[PDB]
């Protein structure tokens, strides 16, 4: 995808200063999992 | 066209039509490729 | 037509000029006056460039523009970066920080005592967009 | 006498720089393998 | 109630801009009501 | 029929002179109001 | 189809109608995609 993959190198920068992301560029933001990938497994791992 | 004659030397022309074409720009923003889209059923593909 | 000189109501001549604007890939020639600022970057500021008018942040860039290419843009068709008019120097655009704001709550019944959430923030700009500097110091002590 | 003039003709349709992204433009361009 | 010139009318209406628009007066976008005008050459037009 | 076309570039333009003139009858315009136009910048201005 | 052209472009009373047009398009597009995510989303919980 064209605008997701470029939400992604939004991330990457460090260097760039006022980069709020989740503002992509018109309003359309990502709200993260609550449950994040780390505890994820950590349910399968005890599932398992 | 008498009298002496330069060197050989060899030119082409061909003739431009609106078509529709895909372009790719590469990180500098260099055209690396392109489609050709009313080329081929291939091509059309691509073009979609 | 002959336009009878003192007679035309309708008949007159209405000397008629059209300007037709026309904007291209290129850059402008013609543009409005006198107004080049003095650039400033890293900060949120409203900017116009050669008519494009916007809101972001703009920093210095490393983008390998081409000596013909004015500006360039991001997927969605808006502008990714500039060139100045005034020096040749490439600058990214960055929207200025925003973000969602939630209310974490306990119930009303509960208490009063609140806490907000700014998504997807650093911290550092929470005096930033709300322009902390300027308000009472009632206001402030929430800034950070 | 004709050649095969596979790819070539293709140029910068604007002024405008993109980057890394596939772009489709129409304009007046040479079509591919056409006769020249 | 106004003074307003023959050619003007026009502008006494809402979207409309022109010299008595801007300056003079300025009906509203919103505007809920009548514009009655009729000529009155012979109350206040004289000689000179 | 035989309607002259004038091109004008390269320099800045002071437009508010000719919406602030009483000079012209009909002065209307189709996508930019008379006034702001001094806001706008164009790569090529054509007049008729 | 820019916002910030517009209002620059035109005044008010005339920028309105424009405005209204893409308010009216855009947010029936976005319309479109709520009900495209709510359908979607329903398959989905329906695998979860």
């Given amino acids: 995808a064209g605008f997701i993959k470029q939400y992604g190198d939004c991330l990457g920068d460090i260097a760039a200063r006022d980069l709020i992301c989740a503002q992509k560029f018109n309003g359309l933001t990502v709200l993260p999992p609550l449950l994040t990938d780390e505890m994820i497994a950590q349910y399968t791992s005890a599932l398992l | 066209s008498s009298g002496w004659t330069a060197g050989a030397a060899a030119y082409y022309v061909g003739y431009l039509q609106p078509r529709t074409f895909l372009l790719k720009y590469n990180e500098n923003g260099t055209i690396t490729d392109a489609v050709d889209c009313a080329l081929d059923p291939l091509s059309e593909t691509k073009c979609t | 037509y002959g336009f009878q000189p003192t007679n035309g109501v309708g008949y007159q001549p209405y000397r008629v000029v059209v300007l ?54 991001d997927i969605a068709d808006t502008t990714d970066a500039v060139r100045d008019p005034q020096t040749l120097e490439i600058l990214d655009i960055t929207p200025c920080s925003f973000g969602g704001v939630s209310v974490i709550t306990p119930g009303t019944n509960t208490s009063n005592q609140v806490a907000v959430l700014y998504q997807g923030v650093n911290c550092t700009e929470v005096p930033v967009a709300i322009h902390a500097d300027q308000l009472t110091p009632t206001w402030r002590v929430y800034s950070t | 006498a004709y050649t095969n003039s596979f790819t070539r003709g293709v140029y910068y349709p604007d002024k405008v720089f993109r980057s890394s992204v596939l772009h489709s433009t129409q304009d007046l361009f040479l079509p591919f393998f056409s006769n020249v | 109630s106004f003074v307003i010139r023959g050619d003007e009318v026009r502008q006494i209406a809402p979207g409309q801009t022109g010299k008595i628009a801007d300056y003079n007066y300025k009906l509203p976008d919103d505007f809920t009501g009548c514009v009655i005008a009729w000529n009155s050459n012979n109350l206040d037009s004289k000689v000179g | ?35 702001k136009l001094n806001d706008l910048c164009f790569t090529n201005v054509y007049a008729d | 189809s820019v916002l910030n052209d517009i209002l620059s472009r035109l005044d008010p009373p005339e920028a309105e109608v424009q405005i209204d047009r893409l308010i009216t398009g855009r947010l ?21």
């Fill in chain 3, 20 to 73: 037709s604007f026309e904007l291209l890939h290129a850059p402008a020639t013609v543009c409005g006056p006198k107004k080049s600022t003095n650039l400033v970057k890293n900060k949120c500021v409203n900017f116009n460039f050669n008519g494009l008018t916007g809101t972001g942040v703009l920093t210095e860039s490393n983008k390998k523009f081409l000596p013909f290419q004015q500006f360039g843009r």
């Fill in chain 6, 1 to 35: 029929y035989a309607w002259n076309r004038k091109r004008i570039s390269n320099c800045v333009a002071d437009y508010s002179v000719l919406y602030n003139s009483a000079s012209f009858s009909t002065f209307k315009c189709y996508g930019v109001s008379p006034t």
């Fill in chain 7, 28 to 48: 029936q597009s976005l319309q479109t995609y709520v009900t495209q995510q709510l359908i979607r989303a329903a398959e989905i919980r329906a695998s979860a």
